[PDB]
Amino acid sequence: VDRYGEYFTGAMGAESIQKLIENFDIDAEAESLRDVIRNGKGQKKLRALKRLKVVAAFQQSGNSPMGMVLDAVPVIPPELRPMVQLDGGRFATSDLNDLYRRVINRNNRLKRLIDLGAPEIIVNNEKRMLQESVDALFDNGRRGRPVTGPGNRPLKSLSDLLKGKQGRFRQNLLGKRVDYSGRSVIVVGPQLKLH
């Protein structure tokens, strides 16, 4: 940049990838894979087949690939991340509130650095932490070591609400608790009829 900055443009972080997706011709890169797919060696063709699966979907649907890079993050309504009071006077909140709070904390600190014209080393190292915060809010633990809460317990991210036996699907959609029901010990009764 000090020498030939007039000639090229580069960037770091997530905002750079946002620029690559904009300067991207979907139809051309789709056809470029089709040429390799039409006549190619299996070693390097299978790796070209799978790319088309992703690229072709963006082309037909009419939805831009830019959605993979976020300028704004939605906040889930509060009753789905409720903060309950405890019989000891203190409080207890959902882990989603500590994740949303950490995104807000780091996003507001970045707003100060941009205003202050802080050195690029602090702004870039801050922007990195904002990426890890949104990564933790959406899927904590996916990349690297997860955000531990008090007691080295990993916080439950938004995507943790949908996975496995404790997730929303299996715990609250495939099976539910029902009214008009009970349970007790069973005792054999020979006098009863089969019905």
Partner 1 sequence: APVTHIWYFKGVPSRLGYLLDLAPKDLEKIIYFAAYVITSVDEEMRHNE
Partner 2 sequence: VSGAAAAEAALMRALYDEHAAVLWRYALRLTGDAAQAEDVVQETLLRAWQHPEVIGDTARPARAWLFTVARNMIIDERRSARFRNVVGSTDQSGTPEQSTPDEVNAALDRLLIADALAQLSAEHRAVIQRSYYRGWSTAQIATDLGIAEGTVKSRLHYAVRALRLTLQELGVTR
Partner 3 sequence: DVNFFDELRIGLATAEDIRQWSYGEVKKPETINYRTLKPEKDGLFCE
Would you tell me which residues interact with DNA (CB under 7 A)? 43, 50, 142-143, 145, 152, 163-165, 170, 175, 177, 183
Q: How far is CA 176 from CA 78, 94, 138, 161, 173, in A?
A: 23, 22, 26, 16, 6
Dihedral angle, C-alpha 40, 41, 42, 47, nearest 10 °: -60
Taking CB under 8 A as the rule, does residue 9 contact partner 2? no
Taking CB under 8 A as the rule, does residue 102 contact partner 1? no
Taking CB under 8 A as the rule, does residue 131 contact partner 3? no
Residues numbered 112 to 141 that lie near partner 1 (CB under 8 A) are 124-125, 127-128, 130-132, 134-135, 138-139
Nearest one of 165, 140, 133 to 155, comparing CA atoms: 140
Residue with tokens 């906040």: 75
Taking CB under 8 A as the rule, does residue 10 contact partner 1? yes
Dihedral sign of CA atoms 96, 157, 69, 7 in order: positive
**Residue 131 CB, nearest distance to partner 1 (Å)?**
5
Nearest one of 155, 152, 160, 145 to 102, comparing CA atoms: 155
Asked if 155 contacts 136 with a C-beta cutoff of 8 angstroms, the reply is: yes
Binding test (CB under 8 A) with partner 2, winner from 52, 58, 156, 158: 156
Nearest one of 32, 26, 33 to 57, comparing CA atoms: 26
Q: Which is nearer to DNA, 90 or 183 (CB)?
A: 183
Taking CB under 8 A as the rule, does residue 91 contact partner 3? yes
Taking CB under 8 A as the rule, does residue 30 contact partner 1? no
Q: Is residue 36 within a helix (H) or strand (E), and if so which, with residue range? A: helix 26-38
Where do contacts with partner 2 occur on this chain (CB under 8 A)? 82-84, 86, 89-95, 98, 102, 105-106, 109, 113, 118-122, 125-126, 129, 132-133, 136, 145, 147-153, 155-156
Where do contacts with partner 1 occur on this chain (CB under 8 A)? 4, 6-21, 23-24, 50-51, 53-55, 58, 65, 67-71, 73, 110, 124-125, 127-128, 130-132, 134-135, 138-139, 142-143, 159
